Design a protein around this ligand. Sequence first.
Ligand SMILES: CC[C@H](C)[C@H](NC(=O)[C@@H](CC(=O)NC)Cc1ccc(OP(=O)(O)O)cc1)C(=O)N[C@@H](CC(N)=O)C(N)=O
Ligand SMILES: CC[C@H](C)[C@H](NC(=O)[C@@H](CC(=O)NC)Cc1ccc(OP(=O)(O)O)cc1)C(=O)N[C@@H](CC(N)=O)C(N)=O
Lengths: 101, 101
Amino acid sequence: MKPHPWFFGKIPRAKAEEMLSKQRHDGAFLIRESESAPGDFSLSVKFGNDVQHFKVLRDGAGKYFLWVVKFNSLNELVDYHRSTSVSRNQQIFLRDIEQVP
Amino acid sequence: MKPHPWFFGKIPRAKAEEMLSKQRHDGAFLIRESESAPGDFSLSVKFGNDVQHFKVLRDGAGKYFLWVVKFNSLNELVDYHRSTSVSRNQQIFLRDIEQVP
Ligand SMILES: CC[C@H](C)[C@H](NC(=O)[C@@H](CC(=O)NC)Cc1ccc(OP(=O)(O)O)cc1)C(=O)N[C@@H](CC(N)=O)C(N)=O
Ligand SMILES: CC[C@H](C)[C@H](NC(=O)[C@@H](CC(=O)NC)Cc1ccc(OP(=O)(O)O)cc1)C(=O)N[C@@H](CC(N)=O)C(N)=O
């Protein structure tokens, strides 16, 4: 197993936008630890000339979700959204960022 | 910025032990998403011929901690424990795993 290329920890929201702006393909994303909401995660995704931000929500048991379907881990939430759009306005599917070697 | 080499998402506790057992230096670690406690994180660390597991605890606001000092993110908790032992029985400091290229 290898570490996930999408977990950036505590990077500012603006930094996520700076990074994803340079990505070529829509869907390029990263999970970050919110600075405005300590203890919560945020999902930042590239789409066109913009970067969309989503709150990773939790149900009463601690399961994670964006809209309706929830999971036992961020890992599963991320994988589910690689084939089910994270957006309700466009078909945007998560894909790993082209990491800098 | 680059993704953190310590976040492995949802990997089994046994898999974390398998991986860390191969690491040469004490302190080599990874953060994983608990399978027994969905929504919670676990910290696995190598020490000698064993792999120690810690529950990443949360306070009422969602801050993370192992013992007493708490942080606004897993990222900060991890960095704090690179210079303050995660153990009360041995001086074990977190250090990035020697990732396989
Ligand atoms: C345009 C992207 C998506 C579609 C849209 N996003 C949103 O509504 C954003 C709004 C925002 O960024 N406010 C500052 C949600 C959001 C709110 C705060 C936030 O703070 P940071 O952790 O500091 O970045 C991050 C994201 C949405 O409808 N989100 C849904 C679904 C979701 N899980 O976010 C919602 N608002 O419940
Ligand atoms: C030997 C390692 C450390 C020192 C020790 N660890 C512990 O007590 C472990 C016990 C355990 O693994 N039970 C199965 C805590 C622990 C408990 C459950 C667990 O489940 P998984 O997410 O499925 O792996 C992981 C770790 C401890 O005293 N931990 C403290 C501090 C902490 N934050 O874990 C505690 N138990 O509160």
